[PDB]
């Protein structure tokens, strides 16, 4: 059934399970024509999925020759997400495939049930969580990558750096959400905190700086100050 | 012209007739129907005055035999029976006229009702899809399931209705996924109707059965494969002309002969609103849409 505050633990057991979500597939600006009309232009996009228990990231990376002489656009791009998400389980050893994919949006669900139906017990659910996935592009390396492709590619990444190293995939999962609900927010702010001081790094082979534990929790309230203030700003309040 | 017998009538009940029906009393001497038009299929159906529930009834054709209904008090019920003594069986028909205890088939002659809603029905059809193959009659009820809502227990007592299914792999060909799920053509047409069904005749057919049974006895797993066989049309981009014009003639009748009230129940909100107004064929059902829009608006 669908994923929710009740359920949520079930995250970060050992049941194989992979987040799908699909908003940065098909990416377009919108501008003017030289007669005055609209016309858009697609970018780059990816599709994220993520395994939550281990940070790693299957980041599929949709380049703009997808659509050519295509219609109907923002329907293909839930097909194509199916057909990518299909294929990188059947990519993947047995033992590896997931036994749960969950996306983030609910018509993701009858393209992957039918891209799927090859595997009929890998069971395809629909969540009731506000996951920030959308803000994916925030990250400055997967933005990177993504913009500078040239053909469709694969590429892994591990979304945790190291910090399954040091805390459980529960208080990883909460980080990584608190970072990405933030960006989302106010992407200006969220990534002046965490570059304002040049002597913390981020590693060739990572994607956030090298915080200790004791920066990653006056980083961690900093992000919290942050979501909290716009909020009232957004209502009001 | 043909007459189905009642060896007595026991119980108060509720008997019908194709469209038709009328009350009976506790032992009032009630003998049988008479002047049932040869050519059609025709259906007997009972509910009985102390149990509004299970609706049931028969499925025959008097060309395939004599047949006659006789109440059974061990298993409660009006029971079908065939006689195999022609000479035996018109003596008890004429001797029930000459005492005039049956009810006339009461059709009027204007009207094509019962015809057009059982234009494709074949009895042939009707017994693979209720399997008890030592009778010439089928027996239905309101509770019998169908053999897909079987696979989601008893299969001697199953509707085995064709299993459609939108999401299955017969319905999808691989590496058509999105074309094949989004226009249903080639699931309709070539696994369908030139695999399954053959011709649309058998198609129509099952499609008729289905809704009469829903109609007759509320069987619910019946209004499923009703509502599925016309969502599987509605939702194809390449139909013959042929069958549209055939599905908007048989689609008008059933509308027009729904009891009112049971429009709630019977009626599938999405599956109609999607046919009449977001798929492929929303413009080529005009008398079902004209007859919907008048009679039922609250549904759309």
Known sequence: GAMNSSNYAELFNNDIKLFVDDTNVYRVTVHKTFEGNVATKAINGCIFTLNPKTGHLFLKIIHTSVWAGQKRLSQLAKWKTAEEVSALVRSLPKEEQPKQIIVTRKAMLDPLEVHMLDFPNIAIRPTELRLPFSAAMSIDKLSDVVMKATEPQMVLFNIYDDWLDRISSYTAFSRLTLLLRALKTNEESAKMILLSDPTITIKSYHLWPSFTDEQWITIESQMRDLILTEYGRKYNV | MNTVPFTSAPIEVTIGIDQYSFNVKENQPFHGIKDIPIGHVHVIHFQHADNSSMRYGYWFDCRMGNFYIQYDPKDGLYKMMEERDGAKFENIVHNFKERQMMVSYPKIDEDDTWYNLTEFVQ????????????????????????????????????????????????????????????????????????????????????????????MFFGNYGSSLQWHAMIELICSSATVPKHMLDKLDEILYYQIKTLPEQYSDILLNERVWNICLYSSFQKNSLHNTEKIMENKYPELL
């Open chain 2, 123 to 214: 009895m042939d059809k009707i017994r693979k899809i209720v399997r008890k193959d030592e009778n010439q009659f089928s027996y239905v009820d309101s509770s019998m399931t169908t053999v897909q809502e079987n696979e989601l227990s008893d299969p001697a007592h199953s509707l085995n209705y064709t299993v459609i299914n939108f999401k299955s792999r017969e319905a999808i060909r691989p590496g058509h996924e999105m074309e094949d799920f989004l226009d249903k053509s080639y699931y309709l047409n070539t696994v369908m109707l030139q695999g399954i069904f053959k011709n649309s005749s058998n198609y129509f057919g099952e499609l008729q059965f289905a809704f009469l049974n829903a």
